[PDB]
Amino acid sequence: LVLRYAARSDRGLVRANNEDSVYAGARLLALADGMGGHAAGEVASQLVIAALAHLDDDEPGGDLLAKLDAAVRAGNSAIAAQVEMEPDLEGMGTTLTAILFAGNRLGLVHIGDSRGYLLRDGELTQITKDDTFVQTLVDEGRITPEEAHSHPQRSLIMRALTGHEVEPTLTMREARAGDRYLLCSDGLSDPVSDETILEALQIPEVAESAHRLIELALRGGGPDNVTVVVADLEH
Numbered sequence: 001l002v003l004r005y006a007a008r009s010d011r012g013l014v015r016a017n018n019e020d021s022v023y024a025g026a027r028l029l030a031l032a033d034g035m036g037g038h039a040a041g042e043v044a045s046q047l048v049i050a051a052l053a054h055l056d057d058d059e060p061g062g063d064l065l066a067k068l069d070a071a072v073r074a075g076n077s078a079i080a081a082q083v084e085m086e087p088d089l090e091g092m093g094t095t096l097t098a099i100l101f102a103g104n105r106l107g108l109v110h111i112g113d114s115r116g117y118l119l120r121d122g123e124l125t126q127i128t129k130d131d132t133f134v135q136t137l138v139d140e141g142r143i144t145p146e147e148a149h150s151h152p153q154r155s156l157i158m159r160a161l162t163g164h165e166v167e168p169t170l171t172m173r174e175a176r177a178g179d180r181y182l183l184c185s186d187g188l189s190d191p192v193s194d195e196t197i198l199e200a201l202q203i204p205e206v207a208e209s210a211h212r213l214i215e216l217a218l219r220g221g222g223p224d225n226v227t228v229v230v231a232d233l234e235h
């Protein structure tokens, strides 16, 4: 199995700079939505993606999940070390969603409100859980999935890599030929619904699909940095 991918990142129409970072290679897809004043979010997302990049070089083998886990923790430690060197960066952090492929298996690591999706046999499923305030309220039965869509704090992030102790979610999944994956920052999914994302993901060529996702986000106002990685598994 091989990966045919397209990655696209845009500042949007509002923000002064782009604090999303993204990696896409032969076996690793990774997306980090950074935050922090004075472009410190660029630093956090860069540091975490750089720590994961080496996972692209070799077949993971036995402990694919432990290797993903170690890379994420190494990125988180790099943030802590960078804050030590320049204490004015305190507060900076980033989400991370990444998939590492190994034949008919993949490892998924996730923290924050970036998203991973699978499109398989015409059906779209979100394979990550949002660390947002509305997700906390849904888990407690305080609101319904429907009221979450209009809640003023619906994009509010509750957990991220900030250089402190963290436990990201690690999942092993089955991967199939014909699958299409999407990684995205909340700059896509805040303005664009899953119904619309699905239509864009059925565009045959991966680069045209990714372009369309960015276009739709910008048509919804482009309030945030928007980043996507669209990838196909083929024979």
Ligand SMILES: [Mn+2]
Pocket (backbone or CB within 6 Å): 019, 020, 033, 034, 035, 041, 225
């Ligand atoms: Mn950001």
Ligand SMILES: [Mn+2]
Pocket (backbone or CB within 6 Å): 113, 154, 155, 156, 157, 186
């Ligand atoms: Mn958000």
Ligand SMILES: [Mn+2]
Pocket (backbone or CB within 6 Å): 033, 185, 186, 187, 224, 225
């Ligand atoms: Mn964002």
